[PDB]
Amino acid sequence: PIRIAINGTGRIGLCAIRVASQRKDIEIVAINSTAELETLLHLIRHDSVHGHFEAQLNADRTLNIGHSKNILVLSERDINKLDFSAANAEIIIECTGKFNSLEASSAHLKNSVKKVIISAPAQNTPTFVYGVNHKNYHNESVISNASCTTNASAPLLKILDEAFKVENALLTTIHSYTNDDIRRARAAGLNLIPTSTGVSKAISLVLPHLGPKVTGLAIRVPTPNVSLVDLSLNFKKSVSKASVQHALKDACKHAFKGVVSIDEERLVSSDFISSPFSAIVIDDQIMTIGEKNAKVLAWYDNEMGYSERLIDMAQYIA
Amino acid sequence: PIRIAINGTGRIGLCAIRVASQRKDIEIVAINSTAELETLLHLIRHDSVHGHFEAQLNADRTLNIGHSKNILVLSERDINKLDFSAANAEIIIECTGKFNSLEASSAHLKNSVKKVIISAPAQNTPTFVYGVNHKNYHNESVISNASCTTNASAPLLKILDEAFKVENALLTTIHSYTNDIRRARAAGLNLIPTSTGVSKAISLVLPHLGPKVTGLAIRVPTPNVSLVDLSLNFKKSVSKASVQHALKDACKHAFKGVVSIDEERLVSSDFISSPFSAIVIDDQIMTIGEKNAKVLAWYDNEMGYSERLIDMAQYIA
Amino acid sequence: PIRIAINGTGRIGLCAIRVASQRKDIEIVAINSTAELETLLHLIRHDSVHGHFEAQLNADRTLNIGHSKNILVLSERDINKLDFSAANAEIIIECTGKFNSLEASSAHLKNSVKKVIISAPAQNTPTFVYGVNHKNYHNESVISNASCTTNASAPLLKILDEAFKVENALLTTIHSYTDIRRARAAGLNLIPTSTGVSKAISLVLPHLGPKVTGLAIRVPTPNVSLVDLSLNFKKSVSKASVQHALKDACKHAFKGVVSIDEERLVSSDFISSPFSAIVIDDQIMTIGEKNAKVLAWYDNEMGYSERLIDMAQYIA
Amino acid sequence: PIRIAINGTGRIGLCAIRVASQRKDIEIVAINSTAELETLLHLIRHDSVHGHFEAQLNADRTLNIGHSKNILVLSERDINKLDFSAANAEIIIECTGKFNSLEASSAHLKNSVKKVIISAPAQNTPTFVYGVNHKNYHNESVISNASCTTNASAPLLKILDEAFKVENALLTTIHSYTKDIRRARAAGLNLIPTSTGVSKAISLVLPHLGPKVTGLAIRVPTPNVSLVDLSLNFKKSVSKASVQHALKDACKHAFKGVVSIDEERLVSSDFISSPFSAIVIDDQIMTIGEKNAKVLAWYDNEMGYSERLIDMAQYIAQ
Ligand code: NA
Ligand code: NA
Ligand code: NA
Ligand code: NA
Ligand code: NA
Ligand code: NA
Ligand code: NA
Ligand code: NA
Ligand code: NA
């Protein structure tokens, strides 16, 4: 199996642990956490959003979770002292948020450690979204998995561009913040909060030909975990509700199998908690206006889709 | 004063009462409510969103609110028995939700009662949005004030069409719901996509634009303050600054008192009880390519609409 | 298998369907619902709180759920026209809220149909709480399963009275909900409400009911509620002795009914719990010789619904 | 007027600014904040809970709010460098949460500074609750105003003890929130029980009662308006009517302006911004047996406490 270590046990790290533990060709050899061991085990077992999970402590105080039966637990805040090579980790999943740059995360590249995947946008760092541009990977030692919002948006842009040619698009993310710029200085409270999110630049990293043609924003909403992306697109080729439906359905069967899904059951946001998909298209709400414009909406769990792609990327770059 | 009666004391009726009570050239002569007198008084006085409000009972058990010092309180569910004419009302603000059609609301027309404004979309009913097409009013006896969502989106459409010529637009309403199979879902804390007939609603007040627009709503569990998100494609070229400038200029002139601009980077709860039909989010205006813009605006889904209701009452009188 | 019908597909009716479908000795033979068939199916399959559940439609348009393979679906508002007898139903789980009285629910009784359990407090109706007084059943044909609040509090009152002898108690239910106060917007408010605790407890523990009273505070969270008992006892208590008395009851007389949380969990961890009450072990406290505070969680749909079916199996 | 300075502009410091600005015998001469001046002015003016407030910048970059027309704005994190004496401050309202101890806050006692009131429980610090034990104040230079919870419960305990003699009481605080493993869980939408050292807290202000009372808090995800729920056992026999009368009488007399009664059957949101330490829920008072009662009371988590903080400032200045 591919030997990985997870650095950081916030929400993303915890979800990565749970996801990676279920992949038969992964072995988690080490977790580094600011939490004491017993607290870490509690947090893995009990989750306000994703429910209960099986995890045990071995007699030797390693963790035993799924396929990963011998997980060393560390608690070293100083990246220069942290030694994942001693656990024979090959791939570091960097989930602390304290090293989100090429230079900072490169400090992990010690002795036998092969690669780092940063679970966030990272300054000066090659960025990949599984299903979108991962096949452009060329042995880079330190990469970014972008954001949950880009992982939802970028597949949809790619499908729709390949089918109808995107001339321009406007994206609104409805970002569910319950479990997650002067407007930031206020209590979130139960407010709707608009925020700029650098969509164009973010898309440019993984779809360089589209980034300059798209922009948008986020609206933060006090609901839990499940977010929605709202794409308003202008295409070169003429479109209908049916042709757009077909292009998305077909991609989910083929090039985006396991990454994009379609909801034909008229479900609501809570139905997608813990979904593994990067995006789940809201089929019945696909609409067109004029010859060349469409609106496409898609759900995503802002933790689980991203975490599944993070471990997909680990498997791929190995 | 213009003598009005309010039928229904749900959320819109209550807000209409509060608004009307503060207008010097309005007199609320009657309120018909399914609530008992004392309950009605409590609901007028204490509001979980809009706060506390001064109201008294007179000795003779009429209500006393602001400029309306002698409001008769009725409790008659049958519109054919209901007689607002006994209080010399000239205009009905129809807020019950039970008579949202021309045929049904025409039952109000008797004796002194010459006009009805329905506080909702209504079948076969002439529909007006103040600032958008109210000047086309031609003495119709029963009209609709449309919805809160249309009152926010239609002004923005008209301003931007006049400036840049709308070719197409997509409108997402983020509809605050704290106060179709998806509707069978105990909303809980769900986000809920909903079709809303945007094209038809806009066609009623901007016939030239209705066919060029569509969209939807996303119901969200926050209170009162909603947002509309317009994605527009224009004939003329645009920029953030030129869109900003067109909206700002409209708020000084033809949409004064109807559309406002937020330049202070506020959040939703800052607009609770706002009287505007829409408050443009200045800093979040954006464009892409030569011809496309995104415009967001806030609105309180009760208070903007209720202010317009009474504006329309004064105008049609 | 014992053949039951569910009348009403609100929250409690849906949860009773799901629970009953997983019990091998129960066959659901009919459901009556104001929803159209396809909508009912959707609501059984998809739940904003309890998650996704497997359910299928047969060719003949009966439902197939768990051990209940051939469920007749009805839609009849008139209790006199409605006939669960045609599916050979012995017991009705009455969950509409429209017939919460002995007189009203008696109309179910016809043919195969021998018994009704009303899923709420019902006027003039023999009331039982499983593990508290169900063994006092003497074949009554219409019974009430009381409320979710009483199913949580009555077991705890019984355990603690037997151990230490209740002199008096005050109960506060924090009731998760996602009289002029009822005209006020739910969401956005803590709402105190009287709930006739004393009377409700008197129905199932007649000696205790007069010694207790309380109220509820309605809070905008989903499903998982808490009961907060402040008790004065004749015998002396400590955290340790109270803890021990509750723990022992969970192993013995209240096994499967009351549980203890020793893991310091929070409310959302008990969503879908089958227990009538889960005691919050670390938050038990005493003061003076004679006073204790005991908290317990409960899912206000699932524990109650498990009890509903438990009671069906018992009175059969 | 009494010259005060406010250290810290979190929620409590912001409320203290607004309350103090409206007191004719107070002058706020300085505010120390981690925020830049323009951001502070924004936070004072616009509040998600208490609404909009008038505040202006003077030409000389002081703030002008209510009776405080010349407020100096500082941004010094190091308490040893911070010089409130340069603004002739007499009373420091210590609202940062970084110096909640006698030793730590005594660093404020420089040059012309006369007194410090800490807006939190503080280690080794004389603690006072206005209306409960403030008349026991004896010139102490550093004091604590306790917590918002204690400010609600202690007045009720004192009133009811004086009337009927508390033998024992059990207190549950329903705390509206917008080592203890439960704190490792993002609050989220959860109800969260927490031990809160009620007995010790009460002991500080009512030493004779602290040993007879205990309790806990349940954290609930509603904004600002909290409830205290007291279950009391008395020496003297009580009735609903006698308990009602005792509370009503105290609100007219010894607790005028501190405790009030709600006879209008209102709900939590109706008390947002209330200045009272506690608002008794009159219709929900109940007794059982001869000697036991339950009493509930509302309070705004911020405003009641902030009003008392400035009341205490005015009191100790004299
Ligand atoms: Na009517
Ligand atoms: Na105009
Ligand atoms: Na503004
Ligand atoms: Na509006
Ligand atoms: Na008691
Ligand atoms: Na304390
Ligand atoms: Na006072
Ligand atoms: Na207080
Ligand atoms: Na005062």
Q: Which residue of B has its CA nearest to D268?
A: B48
- For residue C78, the distance in angstroms to the closest alpha carbon of chain B comes to 22
Q: Is D288 exposed, middle or buried (0-12, 13-18, 19+ CB in 10 A)?
A: buried
Q: Which residue of A has its CA nearest to D34?
A: A185
Interchain CB distance below 8 Å, D48 and A178: no
Q: In b/e form, how buried is each residue of A33-66, taking b as 16+ CB within 10 angstroms?
A: bebebeebbbbbbbbbbbeebebeeeeeebbebb
Of residues D289, D161, D174, D198, the one with CA closest to residue C232? D289
Other CB atoms within 10 A of residue C61 CB: 10
**Whole-angstrom Cα distance, residue A45 to residue C148?**
28
CA of D311 to the centre of ligand 9 (A): 6
**Whole-angstrom Cα distance, residue B80 to residue D91?**
70
Q: Is C201 left (phi over 0), alpha (psi -120 to 50) or beta?
A: alpha
Q: One of C15, C95, C148, C250 is an active-site residue; which one?
A: C148
Q: Is C8 exposed, middle or buried (0-12, 13-18, 19+ CB in 10 A)?
A: buried
**Whole-angstrom Cα distance, residue D163 to residue D159?**
6
Residues of chain D with CATH 3.30.360.10: 148-301
Interchain CB distance below 8 Å, C269 and A42: no
Any idea which architecture B148-301 has in CATH?
2-Layer Sandwich (3.30)
Q: Which two tokens stand for residue C288?
A: 């003076």
Q: Is C96 annotated as a binding residue?
A: no
**Whole-angstrom Cα distance, residue A23 to residue A19?**
7
**Whole-angstrom Cα distance, residue A293 to residue A232?**
7
Interchain CB distance below 8 Å, B172 and A295: yes
Q: What 8-state DSSP symbol labels residue D210?
A: G
Most D-contacting residue of B42, B48, B264 (CB-CB within 10 A), to test interface? B48
Contacts of C222 in chain B (CB under 8 A): 188-189
Contacts of C226 in chain D (CB under 8 A): 191, 193, 218
CA of A289 to the centre of ligand 1 (A): 40
Q: Is D119 annotated as a binding residue?
A: yes
Residues of chain A with CATH 3.30.360.10: 148-302
Interchain CB distance below 8 Å, A189 and D43: no
Q: Is B148 a catalytic residue?
A: yes
**Considering every ligand atom, which ligand is closest to the CA of D45?**
3
CA dihedral C138→C143→C148→C149, nearest 10 degrees, is -70
Q: Which two tokens stand for residue B30?
A: 């009657």
Q: Which residue of D has its CA nearest to B266?
A: D46
**Whole-angstrom Cα distance, residue C232 to residue C237?**
10
Q: What 8-state DSSP symbol labels residue B232?
A: E
The beta-carbon neighbor of D284 closest among C215, C264, C265 is C215
Q: How far, in Å, are A92, A296, C48, D264 from residue B186 at the CA level?
A: 42, 25, 8, 31
CA dihedral B305→B307→B312→B314, nearest 10 degrees, is 170
3-state SS string over chain C? CEEEEEECCCHHHHHHHHHHHCCCCEEEEEEECCCCHHHHHHHHHEECCCEECCCEECCCCCEEECCEEEEEEECCCCCCCCCHHHHCCCEEEECCCCCCEHHHHHHHCECCECEEEECCCCECCCECCCCCCHHHCCCCCEEECCCHHHHHHHHHHHHHHHHHCEEEEEEEEEEECCCHHHHCCCCCCCEEECCCHHHHHHHHCCCCHHHEEEEEEEECCCCEEEEEEEEEECCCCCHHHHHHHHHHHHHCCCCCCEEEECCCCCHHHHCCCCCCEEEEHHHCEEECCCEEEEEEEEECCHHHHHHHHHHHHHHC
**Whole-angstrom Cα distance, residue B108 to residue B79?**
7
Q: Which two tokens stand for residue A105?
A: 């995360």
* Homologous superfamily of the D2-125 domain (CATH): NAD(P)-binding Rossmann-like Domain (3.40.50.720)
Contacts of A269 in chain D (CB under 8 A): none
Q: Which residue of B has its CA nearest to D47?
A: B270
**Considering every ligand atom, which ligand is closest to the CA of B83?**
1
Interchain CB distance below 8 Å, A168 and B212: no
CA of D3 to the centre of ligand 9 (A): 17
Q: Is C147 annotated as a binding residue?
A: yes
**Considering every ligand atom, which ligand is closest to the CA of B161?**
2
Contacts of D221 in chain C (CB under 8 A): 220-221
Resolution in A: 1.7
Of residues B220, C198, B33, C309, the one with CA closest to residue A193? B220
**Residues of D known to be catalytic:** 148
Most B-contacting residue of D269, D273, D298 (CB-CB within 10 A), to test interface? D269
Interchain CB distance below 8 Å, C269 and A52: yes
**Whole-angstrom Cα distance, residue D96 to residue D44?**
16
Interchain CB distance below 8 Å, D191 and C169: no
Interchain CB distance below 8 Å, D188 and A182: no
* Homologous superfamily of the C148-300 domain (CATH): Dihydrodipicolinate Reductase; domain 2 (3.30.360.10)
A-B CB pairs within 8 A amount to 135
Interchain CB distance below 8 Å, B48 and D267: yes
Do A196 and A243 meet the contact criterion of CB atoms below 8 Å apart?
A: no
Q: Which residues pair with C293 in a beta bridge?
A: C230, C285
Handedness of CA D74, D78, D81, D84 (dihedral sign): positive
Q: Which residue of A has its CA nearest to C268?
A: A48
Residues of chain B with CATH 3.40.50.720: 2-125
CA of D132 to the centre of ligand 8 (A): 12
CATH classification (class only), A148-302: alpha beta
Largest CA distance in chain D: 67
Q: Is C196 annotated as a binding residue?
A: yes
Q: Is C9 annotated as a binding residue?
A: no
**Whole-angstrom Cα distance, residue A266 to residue C43?**
12
Most A-contacting residue of B48, B267, B283 (CB-CB within 10 A), to test interface? B267
